[PDB]
Amino acid sequence: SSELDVNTDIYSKVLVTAVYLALFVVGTVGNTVTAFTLTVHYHLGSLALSDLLTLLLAMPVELYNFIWVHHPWAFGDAGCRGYYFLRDACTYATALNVASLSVERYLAICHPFKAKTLMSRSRTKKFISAIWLASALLAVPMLFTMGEQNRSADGQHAGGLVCTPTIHTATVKVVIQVNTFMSFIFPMVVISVLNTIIANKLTVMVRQAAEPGRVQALRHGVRVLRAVVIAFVVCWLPYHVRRLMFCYISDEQWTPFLYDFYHYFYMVTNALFYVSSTINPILYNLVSANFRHIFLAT
């Protein structure tokens, strides 16, 4: 009956939850004030909203039955599906919002005129609504794949059931493999390429100028424009590589030591994943003073 437990240290749970709460009190407020503060404005607001919902949805529910010591699922069979669907939808929203924000910055800095028509001003609201809809549309498998299962050998214990991939490991593997490319590799490459070319366009300006803060401003601009990609790497790659080590490795290799190591890796990867939610308004403040004025005023 009690074969499905995890032996991660309780003090580790306390530390993880404290860090989670700190990141929450940061992001949940920062992203909301950013959304209120507000073509790039629409993209920034959409990204802030995606981060805000990620923190509001993933962190709390996971904090007890996943990010705590109790293995039995406590949100019900419907919760088994709703939690994962919401998590996947918010992850897609964040990744695609970052990609679209990079695209918008590219258009503004490299195509100043035609961007007015292509962005079509107020139609950027419809564009961000479309990206949110696509994010919600790409996460349907999280509804009918993570359902409650009677996993315990007894089948009637106090924790015999828990939310797990229903389908065979092959289908879980293929769905996760498409998910990683559609949510990490594609946005990652788009962001990296566009940010690199924008940084080149800023460096040519810096060379041409080579002012009191113009040089400093452009230097910090390129610094942050690269730190964005570095933060994407750090915050996102661990999550997807953990999911890969979950889905790809079959029953042959699994051992209690690696089992517990993966469980701790869960805490580490999720902490890194949530760090990205808070990182955004920090960089927004560190970049632009005009935005910082309203942000600190409000």
Binding site: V6, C163, T164, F246, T255, Y259, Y262, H263, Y266
Partner: peptide, 6 residues
Amino acid sequence: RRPYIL
């Protein structure tokens, strides 16, 4: 054993 939490 095998992990149940994705």
